[model samples]
Structure formats: C-alpha cells, structure tokens
Target: MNKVQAPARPGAIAPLSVVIPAHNTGLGPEKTSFFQALSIPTKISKGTIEIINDVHILKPGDKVGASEATLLNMLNISPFSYG
Candidate 1:
C-alpha cells in the first residue's frame, strides 16, 4: 500500500521585544561638577577661542573662483577619483 504525505503547517511569526536596564550607581560630586563645567557653552567657547576655525582661510585669492583645472593643479589631487 502507498502512504500519503500531509501538508506542512506554517510557523508562527511574532514581533521581538527588547528592554535595557539602567545603572543605579551615582556619579561623584567632583566628576559631576567637571562634567557640568565641560557641558557649558562658556567653557567650550574659551577652549576653542584661540583656534582659527575657517575653511575659507586655506584658499588663495587668485584660486578663489578658478576653474576645475586650476583647483586640481593647485591641490595636486585627482578630482575624478573622489566621486
């Protein structure tokens, strides 16, 4: 006698859930004060005040509006290799 095979049942699909636990340990007073000082804008400004943060400062006046060829020649870099 020949045996008959039954159809396979579909597997159940369920959404996954994730939970993260928070640490209870508190920060030290001195460390907290230091972090607060660093987080403030005044400290950040004072730290970077001496630095000249300008991209335009690097470009020469004559090469400001120069063609692609001039820029490539000035930097000696292959522009085609970038993108």
Candidate 2:
C-alpha cells in the first residue's frame, strides 16, 4: 500500500521532516521536557538521550526520526509554511 493510504502511527519514524532554526531552547536541569524523563521504546531508539543543536535541522528531504520529532513537539518548535 502507498504511504498516503497507510495509517499513521504516533511512534512511526517520519519520512519527511522540516528543518528547524537554532535558538536558545534553554533545555536544562529546570527546563527539561517531560519527554526527557520518559522512556522511549526500542521502536524509537536505544533508550538514550539525544540532542540536536544544528543551525538547520532536518528538512522534508531528510528523516526526522521519532526522537527528534518528539523533542521538537515537546519544545513546541515550528516550521511555518504559508504558501
């Protein structure tokens, strides 16, 4: 079946992702997201904490991977597309 016809899973790795801007997210001891404490199933990764501080994160052409997308969502980061 084609991707569009397939059902989307929350933990599924996204084939398309939007690039993110680098900013002072301030994710620290006090600014940690709940996701930081949550255990990611093997479906996501090796259950290790990962960080992405690139000036230009992943884009639609690249995969976002479940962990990064979850972190972005937790931080409420966005990729505005108004065209």
Top candidate, metric lDDT: 2
lDDT by residue for model 1 (1-83), tens: 12121111122121122111122113323332322232311122322221112112112222212232332222233322223
In candidate 2, position 65 carries an lDDT of 45
Which digits, one per residue and each the tens of the lDDT, describe model 2 over residues 1-83? Answer: 12222232234444445433334444443333433433221111224323444334444555444555555554455432222
Candidate 2, superposed: residue stretches over 4 Å from native: 1-17, 29-54, 79-83
lDDT, each prediction: 0.23, 0.40
TM-score per candidate, chains pooled = 0.17, 0.36
lDDT of 1 at 72: 26
Task: At residue 12, give the lDDT of candidate 1.
Answer: 17
Q: Evaluate model 2: give its lDDT.
A: 0.40
What is the Cα-based TM-score of model 2?
Answer: 0.36
